[model samples]
Target: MKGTLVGTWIKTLRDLYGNDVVDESLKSVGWEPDRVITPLEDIDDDEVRRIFAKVSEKTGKNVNEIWREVGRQNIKTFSEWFPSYFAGRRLVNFLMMMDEVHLQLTKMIKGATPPRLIAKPVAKDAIEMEYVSKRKMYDYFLGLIEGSSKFFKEEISVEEVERGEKDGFSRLKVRIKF
Candidate 1:
């Protein structure tokens, strides 16, 4: 994943947990407490898992919930960093455009394995989006979806149609209501 995204996660961790906990977690993973991660730098998925795991141990909180909170809070972070994506757009448009959003953003980096985010209109007032990636980021994905609704102030019901790994890809299919 991109360092920019990881950096947002770190920032969210500080907001959700505390600066000391984040610092201690990073140190536990052999990373400097004040390590600098540049926007374009690539991060290893396994290393990220380890750091979050360390945070779980330190805080005695569920690792998955931590991921969810970071993802939920990062919508604001993303809006701050990439305002154009949110400008003049409603939640439906934003959700539907995520496939292109991921593709266009990741295309700048060579050899980036972009997550597959295919969204399609499945009902008169709803859409079904499929999230597919090598890494199992379903909780994060769900959190982001929930955050978008809150950010846009648009009430919507989300139903997880299916979630699991297929072949080598972790997949989540969700239906969003109007």
Candidate 2:
């Protein structure tokens, strides 16, 4: 995991819950109270998992629920941070371009392992997206898709087609109908 993702999670935690909740959650995980995370800095995925676990315990929320809400909130936060990606683009177009965007964004960072987002057009009003990664953050991925639909004000139906691990990679296939 990258610091960027962790930082975004912290920020979104504050946005959705509050600073006090975030502070308590971080403290519970023995993380620094005021750590600054740079975009390229690498962090352990287990550390992030533990942090979220503590947060879930404190808030009486399921870990998956927390990740889903964070994923939903991230749409607006990310758009604010990287306006170019969202600007002058429709929801489907933006999603289809994410494969290339992920590549370009991670190209300069050492040890970067962003999930591969491959999408194919299924119909004029739908697309099938395949998510490939080792991390297997499927709930977050689906939440992001739901958030994208809400952000774009487009009604969409998302159905998971497959989920499993293959040769050290986790795969999740979903059909999104708009």
Candidate 3:
């Protein structure tokens, strides 16, 4: 993961869990308590998992629970930092636009494999979105959708229609109603 995104996770953890827990988790991974990650710096995936595992140990919460909360809160950080992404649009439109952003990032950032997000409108007020990635982070994906709805002040109903591995890819499908 890029430090830009991982940096969001660290801040979200501090907001959701508390500074002490997050600082200690950072130390567990041999990082400074007040480390400031620069954008574009690569953070190893296993190191991220280890840091979160320490956080789970410290908080007595499952790692997935932590990830879900972080996902929900991280959107706030994202919105604050890049308001244009959330500006003057419905949540559905923003969600649809992410597909393009992911594709563009792949071309712009070398060695980057952002998730493949394909969202198609199924009804005037609903969409079916599929998430495809080598890394399985379904709970975080769902939480991000939940956060987007809250941020845009749009009430949404999200139903996970499919989840599993297929052909060496982790895939998830969700039906979302606005």
Candidate 4:
């Protein structure tokens, strides 16, 4: 995972929860409470999982829910950092462009394995997006979709088509109606 994104998650966690919870969670993962993470640096995904697990234990929240909430909150943080992506775009356009944006942004980083976000129009008012990755962060993906709708002030209905793991890849198919 990109250290910058992880740092964003940490800061957002503190914003949503508090300093004590975020600090304790990081400490459990052998990370300094105030560690500086550079944009070019990388962190192990398992380490992030551990930190989230510790936070979950302390907060009595489900780990999946934590990831989802983090994804929702991240929309604001990402928009603040990269305003052009969110500017002058409706909900559908923003989401359709995300796959390309994800590819372009991660291409500069070594070993940055972002999920393949393939979206196709299913109808004039809907789209089907497939989320493919080995990390299997389905809840986070769905949460991001929900957050995008909220951010764009568009009402949407989302339905999970299917989800499964094949070999080492995890796949999630979703249909979103505007």
> Please, what is the TM-score per model?
0.94, 0.95, 0.95, 0.95
What local lDDT does model 4 show for residue 101?
A: 89
Please report how far candidate 1 places residue 120 from its true position, in Å.
Answer: 1.0
Positional deviation of residue 84's Cα in model 3 after best superposition, in angstroms: 1.1
| Higher-TM-score candidate of 1 and 4 | 4
Instruction: Report clashes for each candidate as comma-separated counts.
Output: 0, 0, 0, 0
Would you list the C-alpha lDDT of every candidate in the order shown? 0.88, 0.86, 0.88, 0.88
Estimate, for each residue in 1-178, the C-alpha lDDT of model 2 and write its tens digit: 7777678778888898887878887877677777776886888788788888977887899999999998889888888878999999999998899899888878777676889999999888889999999988888998888888888888889999888898999999999988
Error of 4 at 170 (Å): 0.4
lDDT per residue as tens, model 4, 34-151: 8877787889888999989988999999999998998888887788878999999999899898899888878888676889999999888899999999999998898889889888
Per-residue CA lDDT of model 1 for 60-137, tens digit only, reads: 879898778877888988898799999999998999899998888788798877888899998799899999998888
Q: RMSD per prediction, one decimal?
A: 1.3, 1.2, 1.2, 1.2
Give lDDT for model 1: 0.88
* TM-score computed on alpha carbons, candidate 4: 0.95
For candidate 3, the 10 contiguous residues with the lowest summed lDDT are 103-112
